[PDB]
Design a protein around this nucleic acid. Structure first.
Ligand SMILES: Nc1ncnc2c1ncn2[C@@H]1O[C@H](COP(=O)(O)OP(=O)(O)OP(=O)(O)O)[C@@H](O)[C@H]1O
Ligand SMILES: Nc1ncnc2c1ncn2[C@@H]1O[C@H](COP(=O)(O)OP(=O)(O)OP(=O)(O)O)[C@@H](O)[C@H]1O
Ligand SMILES: Nc1ncnc2c1ncn2[C@@H]1O[C@H](COP(=O)(O)OP(=O)(O)O)[C@@H](O)[C@H]1O
Lengths: 587, 600, 62
DNA sequence: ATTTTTTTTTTTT
C-alpha cells in the first residue's frame, strides 16, 4: 500500500549521497565508490546491508523485508538507467547497422551485466512466504545452464518449466502473411548458471523426532558450498494449492577466514614467537603427556613433500597407538577431530562404514553406489579411527594399499576407482585380555601381522602403573575444571582454537630445505639403528622408510620455524622424539 | 448475506459477549493481553444449550455455515476492544456423543461429533493459499481475489493458477508477502485395538487438520478428536464416494496433566529436612520385593551435564546389571511403568534399535524408511532388556560406540547422519553353569566378554541358597507377603499393618509424592564444594592399589579411573534428591557403601 | 519361412547380410534431432532415432 | 514404482 515510484527518488538519494564518514578514510563516496566500481564493470553482482538503510530512514528497512521482490526489480532497472561515467559485444554487431523506434525493445535483464542479493527449518514456521530469512549441505549437485530470456521476441520466465512459441507475436506476422520462421538465436540468448542441493544440524532436532531436510540458487552464487558444510543461507512457493532462493553462504565454522589456506595475525605474530605454548593451549583438558600432544602437533604441523622423478613421497604423518587403562585416549581423538579442519571419525566397526573407504557390498535394489565413507572423504586431512585392532582381518589389506598414499583401487564392479587417499591416519587400539602384560611381547600379546605395525612411523604405548601421589595430581587437576570451569590457572595464556588454527595456517606453505651438513650426520646417526637394534634378531624390524620418517618430522617442524634453516636443532628433536617413542617397557 | 437469519445468528452468538461470563471469565485479558494470538476462544456446547438451544443445534444440524459468522462475531468483538488483535482478518476458528470409527452410518453429516482412536500415517506439511495480491506496475493498484475450498466453507473461487492479462492486458504481475497461506495436514485414525473383534478387520478413518492444529504428537498415540463431516467428490457422475471428517479441536488424555501450581514445590520443600527419606525412597521400588535400589536411584535420575568453556561436553548416564537365576524379569517392570517414557525393548531383535537400511520392499513409496530407531527415544530416557547373555555381538560393538559417545553415526545411503542420545539401558543374565560363582572362579563362570569393564558403572553381587535357618524365615515372610499382599493386614481391599508398625502412610508413600521430587528435581544444578577431591583421591588410590588382593583379586577385574567419573556423578544424582546446593562428607560416606556391598 | 526351423546351434554359414534399420515406435536415449515432417506456420508428436539389424535370404551350413 | 521371477556376485567354517 506504499507508493512504488517516489520511493525510487528516495533510493536515488540513498545511492548518490553515500559518503558516511564513520571512519577516517570515508570522506569520499562509499556507494559512489561502488557505483564507480560498477563503472569498472568488475562487479556483476552488488551487495546490500541492514546497516545501510538503518541511517537513511526506517521504512523500507522493513517495508521491503516483506516483499523483497518488486523492490528489487525496480532496484534493477533504476541503477540500470544510471551511466555516470560476449553478448555485450555481439549486440553492437547486431545493432551496428541500426523503423528505429518500433522495435522488439530490449528488457534490461537481457543486458544483465550486474546483479543483486541482500543482507540483514523446524523453527521456520509456515507463515514465511515472501520473507527473506536465514537458516543454518547434503547430496551436493552440479552446475548447468538456466535461461532468463530467449530471443527478436522476448519470452521471459520466472517459472522453472516452459514451452517453445511459434511464428512471431509482432506486427511483421500480424495481419500480413509476408513473414519468416522464429528460432532460438543462442548467440543472442541470455542464460544463467544453476546448481541445486538439499538437512538440519541435529543440534536442534527434538529427542522424539528425526532430522528433516530444498535450495535453488542461480547465477553467480553457484559453487559456494560442498557436501557436508555447516552453512548459513540468506521464501517463495513453487507453481489443491499444496523451495528457496538464496544470496550468500556464510559459515562461522568451515569458511574462508576460519579455514586454513582458503597477515591478519601480524600484530600478534610480531608479538608471538614460540613452539612450546601450543601444548599449553592444545587440549588443556589433561595434565602431563606433553610428548603425545606435541607428536600430534607435528601431525598438525605438516609441510613435508617432494615429487621427484615422476613419483611422489608420502608426506603425511601416520601414527598408531595401542593400549588400554585409564589412558582416556578418547578425548584426544575427539579433540583432534574437533579442531582439525576437514576432520572425520569412524570406529572399529559400528554400522554403514566399518571404519573403511567405500565398497560395492547385496539383495536390496539396484544403484551400484560405491558410497564413499569416512576413509574415502578424509583426504587432505585425517580419518581418526578407534580400536583398529578389532576392525577385521580381511580389512588389513584395505589399509595396506591405502598406506603408501593416494591409492585405493576397487576392481569389484569393473572400474578403476582411485579415491585419492591423501589422509593422515590416527590408529588407537587396546591390548587383549589383560592390560599389556609387560612380559607377553608384541605379537605375543597382540595378534596383528607386523606388515601394519611396521608401516606406522611411530607407535606409542602409554601406561601408568600405581603411584600413590600421581593419581592424586590427576584427581585435583580434573576437579579444578569441575569446581571451576577453566583448567589452567596463572600458568600460560591458552589460545582459542580459532586463533590456534590461524597461526597453524602460517605453517603449511614454507618448503623447508636441509643443508648438506646433515646429509652425513643423519646417515651416521641412523647407522646406530641398524647396528644396535639388528645386533640381536629378537629386536624390532626396521624399514627402509624408517629413517625417512624422522626426516619427514624434521623438515615438517621447520614449517613452524619457517626460516629455511633445518639446523642441528631440527633433527635433534627429531631423534629426541624417535628415541622417546621407545624404551618404555624396560623402564 | 444469505437469507437474513444469519445476522440474528451472529447477534445471538454475540449476546454471549457482554456480562459476568464475558466480563469475568472468557476472553480479553485472559488470552489477548497475555499476547498469544492463538485465536481459539474455547467453547462448551452446554452453555449454548443453556442460552440458545436451537443454536446449540444450528451447529449439529447444519455445520456448513455457522462459521464465517462465528468468525464475524469474534473479529467484531476483539476489534471493538483491541485494534491490536485486529489486523489478521481471517476465518479464526475456535474450540467447541462419541461413536467409534466402526460406527459412522451414512450420517452425522453436518454434525460436530467425537470419535476416538489411534494416530497413524502422520504425513507431510503443505501450504495452502488464501488470496491473490495483484498489482499493475502500469497503473499500480494492489488488487485482490480471495480463494477458498470446501475444506473451510461451501464457497470456492475459480480455483486455479494466478490470473493475468485479464484486466486490460496491462502491466500485470503478482506480489508475495501479501497473498497469505494456510498450514495443511493429513492423516488417518484407527480404533483403540484392545476392544477389537476377532472376526472382522477393523476400519480406519481419515481426517484433515489446519493452522494451529499441527501435530503435537506422533503416529501410534491415542487422543480424543472431534470433527464435522463433509464429502467433496462425485459418485459415478465422477467415480464412487469416499469421505472424511474434520473441522476440529484437540485434546490429549494419556498423560499426567498434574494439579501442580507453586503449592507442590512448597510440599517438596516441606519434607526436605527429613533426612533419611532415602529410606522410604529406597522402599519406593521394592514394596513387593531383600536387596541395590538406592543404586538404581541415579539411573532413574539420568545424570548431569558439564562442558568446557570454548570447548565440548561429556556424555552423562549410568548403566548396571549383574547372578543366579529365579528377581530380574519382574523387577525391571518397576521402571517401564513409573518414570517418563523409558522404553524396554526386545533383547534379541533389530529393525528398531537404530537400523533403517531402506527397507521398502512392498509398497515402495516416496520415503525410504530413514527411521527405525527405538533407542533415541531413550534420549534422556531409560531402557531395560533381556537376552544380554544372548545378545548379538553385532551391537556389542555398537554399544562400545554408545557408552563411549552415546551418538549414532550411520551413512547407509539414506544419509550420513548423527543424532544426540543421553541414554541408559539394562540387561539379562545366564551363566552356562548355574551355581558356580566364585569357588571355581569369580569371573567367567558366566559366558561373557570383558571389553565392558569401564563401560558399565558398578560391580555388585546377587546370590542364593535355600537354607536351614532361613528355611522357616522364608516360610513366614513368603506367607506375610501372601497376606500383607491381602486386605486387612470387592475381590480385594487394602492391606496396612506392617505398613503401620512401619510409620508411613500411602499419601506420604505415593507415586505423585514420589515424583514430587522428580520434575523440579531433574532441573537443578548443585555444584560441588571443597571436599570431595581429597578423600576420593586417597580412597581411589587405595581402591586402585589394594582392592586387587587378598582372595578378592579375581573378583577385582574393573579397576579404571573411568570409575572415578562414576564414583562422583552418583553423588550428583543423590545431590539432586534433596536440592542441597553442595555435596558433602555425608554424601561421601553414602557414596562409597556401593563399594562395600559389591563384596564387603 | 522356407528357411525357418531348419537350423540348430553350432553351424557355419555364408548368409546374405542385407542390413536394414528399425522403423521405431518410440526411442530411449535417441536424443539426436527431434523433429517431424510438419508444415510451416503463417496466418503428442513423434521422434526419430533408430538402430541397426540384419536380414537374410540364403544359407549354406558348412 | 509396486505385481510374476533367478542368477551372479557380495563375502564364508
Ligand atoms: N631397489 C630399490 N629401488 C627403489 N627404491 C628402493 C630400492 N630398495 C629400497 N628402496 C626404498 O626402500 C623403501 C621400502 O619400503 P616400501 O615403502 O617400499 O615398502 P613396500 O616395498 O611398498 O612394501 P610392499 O612392496 O610389500 O607393499 C622404499 O620407499 C624404497 O624407496
Ligand atoms: N527378596 C525378594 N523380593 C521379592 N520377590 C522375591 C524375592 N526373592 C524371590 N522373590 C520371588 O521369586 C521370583 C523369582 O522369579 P523371577 O520372576 O524373579 O525370575 P527372574 O529373577 O525375573 O529371572 P531373571 O532375573 O533371570 O529374568 C520373583 O517373582 C520374586 O517375586
Ligand atoms: N591425565 C588425565 N587428565 C584428565 N583426565 C583424565 C586423565 N586420565 C584419565 N582421565 C579421565 O579419563 C576419562 C576418559 O577415559 P577414556 O580416555 O575414554 O579411556 P579410553 O581411552 O580407554 O577410552 C575422562 O573422563 C577423564 O576424566
Amino acid at each position: 500500500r506504499r507508493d512504488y515510484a517516489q520511493d525510487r527518488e528516495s533510493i536515488k538519494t540513498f545511492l548518490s549521497e553515500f559518503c558516511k564518514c564513520d571512519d577516517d578514510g570515508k570522506k569520499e563516496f562509499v556507494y559512489g565508490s561502488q557505483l564507480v566500481k560498477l563503472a569498472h564493470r568488475e562487479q556483476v553482482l552488488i551487495t546490500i546491508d541492514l546497516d545501510d538503510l538503518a541511517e537513511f530512514n526506517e521504512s523500507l528497512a522493513e517495508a521491503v523485508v516483506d516483499n523483497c521482490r518488486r523492490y528489487t526489480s525496480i532496484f534493477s532497472d533504476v541503477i540500470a538507467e544510471l551511466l555516470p561515467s560476449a553478448l555485450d559485444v555481439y549486440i553492437e554487431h547486431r545493432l551496428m547497422m541500426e523503423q528505429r523506434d518500433e522495435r522488439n525493445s530490449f528488457p534490461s535483464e537481457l543486458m544483465k551485466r550486474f546483479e543483486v542479493g541482500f543482507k540483514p527449518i523446524r523453527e521456520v514456521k509456515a507463515q514465511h512466504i515472501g520473507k527473506l530469512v536465514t537458516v543454518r549441505v547434503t547430496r551436493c549437485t552440479e552446475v548447468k545452464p538456466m535461461m532468463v530470456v530467449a530471443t527478436e521476441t522476448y519470452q521471459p520466465v520466472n517459472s522453472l518449466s516452459f514451452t517453445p512459441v511459434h511464428d512471431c507475436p509482432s506486427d511483421d506476422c500480424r495481419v500480413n502473411k509476408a513473414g519468416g520462421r522464429l528460432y532460438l538465436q543462442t548467440r543472442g540468448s541470455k542464460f544463467v548458471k544453476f546448481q541445486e542441493v538439499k538437512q538440519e544440524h541435529s543440534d536442534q532436532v527434538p529427542v522424539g523426532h528425526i532430522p528433516r531436510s530444498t535450495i535453488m540458487c542461480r547465477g553467480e552464487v553457484t559453487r559456494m558450498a560442498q557436501p557436508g558444510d555447516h552453512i548459513v543461507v540468506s521464501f517463495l512457493p513453487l507453481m489443491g494449492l499444496l523451495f528457496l532462493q538464496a544470496h550468500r553462504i556464510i559459515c562461522i565454522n568451515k569458511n574462508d577466514e576460519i579455514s586454513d589456506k582458503d597477515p591478519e595475525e601480524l600484530e600478534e605474530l610480531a608479538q608471538d614467537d614460540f613452539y612450546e605454548r601450543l601444548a599449553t593451549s592444545l587440549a588443556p583438558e589433561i595434565y602431563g603427556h606433553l610428548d603425545v600432544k606435541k607428536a600430534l602437533l607435528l601431525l598438525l604441523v605438516g609441510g613435508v613433500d617432494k615429487r621427484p622423478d615422476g613419483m611422489k613421497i608420502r608426506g603425511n604423518i601416520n601414527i598408531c597407538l595401542m593400549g588400554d587403562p585409564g589412558v582416556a585416549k578418547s578425548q584426544l581423538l575427539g579433540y583432534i577431530s574437533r579442531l582439525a579442519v576437514r576432520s572425520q571419525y569412524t570406529t572399529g566397526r559400528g554400522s554403514s562404514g566399518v571404519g573403511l573407504t567405500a565398497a560395492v557390498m547385496d539383495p536390496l535394489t539396484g544403484e551400484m553406489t560405491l558410497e564413499g565413507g569416512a576413509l574415502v572423504l578424509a583426504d587432505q586431512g585425517v580419518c581418526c579411527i578407534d580400536e583398529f585392532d578389532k576392525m577385521a582381518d580381511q580389512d588389513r589389506t584395505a589399509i595396506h594399499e591405502v598406506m603408501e598414499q593416494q591409492t585405493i583401487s576397487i576392481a569389484k564392479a569393473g572400474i578403476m576407482t582411485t579415491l585419492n587417499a591423501r589422509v593422515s591416519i590416527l590408529a588407537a587400539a587396546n591390548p587383549a585380555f589383560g592390560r599389556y602384560n609387560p612380559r607377553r611381547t608384541v605379537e605375543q600379546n597382540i595378534q596383528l601381522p607386523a606388515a601394519l605395525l611396521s608401516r606406522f612411523d611411530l607407535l606409542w604405548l602409554i601406561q601408568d602403573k600405581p603411584d600413590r601421589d600421581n593419581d592424586l595430581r590427576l584427581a585435583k587437576h580434573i576437579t579444578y575444571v569441575h569446581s571451576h570451569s577453566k583448567q589452567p590457572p596463572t600458568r600460560v595464556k591458552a589460545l582459542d582454537m580459532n586463533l590456534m588454527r590461524r597461526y597453524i595456517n602460517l605453517c603449511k606453505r614454507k618448503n623447508p630445505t636441509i643443508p648438506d651438513e646433515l646429509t652425513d650426520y643423519i646417515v651416521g646417526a641412523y647407522v646406530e639403528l641398524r647396528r644396535e637394534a639388528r645386533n640381536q634378531k629378537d629386536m624390532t624390524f626396521t624399514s627402509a622408510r624408517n629413517l625417512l620418517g624422522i626426516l619427514r618430522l624434521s623438515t615438517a617442524l621447520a614449517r613452524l620455524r619457517l626460516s629455511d634453516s633445518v639446523e642441528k636443532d631440527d633433527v635433534a628433536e627429531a631423534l629426541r622424539l624417535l628415541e622417546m617413542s621407545k624404551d618404555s617397557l624396560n623402564q | 448475506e444469505g437469507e437474513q437469519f444469519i445476522k440474528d445468528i451472529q447477534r445471538e452468538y454475540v449476546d454471549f459477549l457482554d456480562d459476568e461470563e464475558d466480563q469475568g471469565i472468557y476472553a480479553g485479558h485472559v488470552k489477548d493481553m497475555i499476547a498469544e494470538k492463538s485465536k481459539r476462544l474455547i467453547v462448551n456446547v452446554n452453555d449454548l444449550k443453556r442460552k440458545n438451544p436451537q443454536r446449540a443445534l444450528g451447529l449439529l444440524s447444519n455445520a456448513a455455515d455457522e462459521q464465517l459468522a462465528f468468525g464475524r462475531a469474534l473479529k467484531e468483538y476483539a476489534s471493538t476492544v483491541d485494534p491490536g488483535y485486529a489486523k489478521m482478518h481471517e476465518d479464526l476458528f475456535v474450540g467447541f456423543r462419541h461413536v467409534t470409527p466402526r460406527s459412522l452410518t451414512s450420517i452425522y453429516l453436518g454434525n460436530m461429533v467425537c470419535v476416538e482412536g489411534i494416530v497413524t500415517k502422520v504425513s507431510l506439511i503443505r501450504p495452502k493459499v488464501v488470496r491473490s495480491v495483484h498489482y499493475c506496475p502500469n497503473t499500480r493498484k494492489v488488487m485482490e481475489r480471495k480463494y477458498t475450498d470446501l475444506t473451510s466453507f461451501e464457497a470456492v473461487p475459480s480455483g486455479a493458477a494466478y490470473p493475468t492479462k485479464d484486466e486490460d492486458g496491462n502491466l500485470l504481475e503478482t506480489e508475495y508477502g501479501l497473498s497469505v497461506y494456510k498450514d495443511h495436514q493429513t492423516l488417518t485414525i484407527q480404533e483403540m485395538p484392545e476392544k477389537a473383534p476377532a472376526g472382522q478387520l477393523p476400519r480406519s478413518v481419515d481426517i484433515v487438520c489446519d493452522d494451529d492444529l499441527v501435530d503435537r504428537c506422533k503416529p501410534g498415540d491415542r487422543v480424543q478428536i472431534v470433527g464435522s463431516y463433509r464429502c467433496l467428490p462425485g459418485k459415478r457422475g465422477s467415480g464412487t464416494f469416499r469421505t472424511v471428517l474434520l473441522a476440529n479441536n484437540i485434546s490429549l488424555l494419556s498423560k499426567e496433566s498434574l494439579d501442580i501450581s507453586r503449592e507442590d514445590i512448597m510440599l517438596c520443600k516441606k519434607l526436605a529436612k527429613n533426612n533419611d527419606i532415602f529410606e522410604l525412597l529406597s522402599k519406593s521400588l521394592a514394596p513387593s520385593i531383600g536387596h541395590v535400589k538406592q543404586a538404581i536411584l541415579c539411573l532413574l535420575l539420568g545424570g548431569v551435564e558439564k562442558i568446557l568453556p570454548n570447548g565440548t561436553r561429556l556424555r552423562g548416564d549410568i548403566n548396571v546389571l549383574l547372578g543366579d537365576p529365579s528377581a530380574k524379569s519382574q523387577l525391571l517392570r518397576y521402571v517401564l511403568n513409573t518414570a517418563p517414557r523409558a522404553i524396554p525393548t526386545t533383547g534379541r531383535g533389530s529393525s528398531g534399535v537404530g537400523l533403517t537400511a531402506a527397507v521398502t520392499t512392498d509398497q515402495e513409496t516416496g520415503e525410504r524408511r530413514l527411521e527405525a530407531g527405538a533407542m533415541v527415544l531413550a534420549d534422556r530416557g531409560v531402557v531395560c532388556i533381556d537376552e544380554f547373555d544372548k545378545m548379538s555381538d553385532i551391537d556389542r560393538t555398537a554399544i562400545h560406540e554408545v557408552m563411549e559417545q552415546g551418538r549414532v553415526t550411520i551413512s547407509k545411503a539414506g544419509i550420513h547422519a548423527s543424532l544426540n542420545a543421553r541414554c541408559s539401558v539394562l540387561a539379562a543374565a545366564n551363566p552356562v553353569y548355574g551355581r558356580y560363582d566364585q569357588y571355581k572362579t569369580p569371573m567367567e563362570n558366566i559366558g561373557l566378554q570383558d571389553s565392558l569393564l569401564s563401560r558399565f558403572d558398578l560391580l555388585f553381587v546377587m546370590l542364593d541358597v535355600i537354607d536351614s535357618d532361613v528355611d522357616q524365615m522364608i516360610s513366614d515372610h513368603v506367607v506375610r507377603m501372601h497376606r500383607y499382599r491381602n486386605p486387612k493386614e470387592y475381590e480385594k481391599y487394602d492391606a496396612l499393618l506392617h505398613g503401620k508398625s512401619r510409620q508411613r502412610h500411602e499419601k506420604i508413600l505415593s507415586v505423585e509424592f514420589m515424583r514430587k521430587y522428580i520434575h523440579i528435581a531433574k532441573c537443578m544444578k548443585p555444584k560441588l564444594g571443597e571436599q570431595a577431591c581429597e578423600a576420593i583421591a586417597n580412597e581411589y588410590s587405595r581402591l586402585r592399589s589394594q582392592e586387587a588382593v587378598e582372595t578378592d583379586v579375581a573378583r577385582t577385574q574393573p579397576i579404571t579411573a573411568r570409575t572415578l567419573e562414576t564414583l562422583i556423578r552418583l553423588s550428583t544424582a543423590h545431590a539432586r534428591a534433596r536440592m542441597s546446593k553442595s555435596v558433602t562428607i555425608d554424601d561421601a560416606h553414602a557414596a562409597i557403601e556401593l563399594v562395600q556391598f559389591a563384596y564387603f | 519361412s522356407e528357411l525357418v526351423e531348419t537350423v540348430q546351434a553350432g553351424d557355419r554359414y555364408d548368409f546374405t547380410g542385407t542390413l536394414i534399420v528399425v522403423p521405431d515406435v518410440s526411442v530411449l536415449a535417441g536424443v539426436g534431432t527431434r523433429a517431424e515432417n510438419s508444415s510451416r506456420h503463417k496466418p503428442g508428436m513423434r521422434e526419430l532415432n533408430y538402430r541397426m539389424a540384419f536380414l537374410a535370404c540364403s544359407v549354406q551350413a558348412t
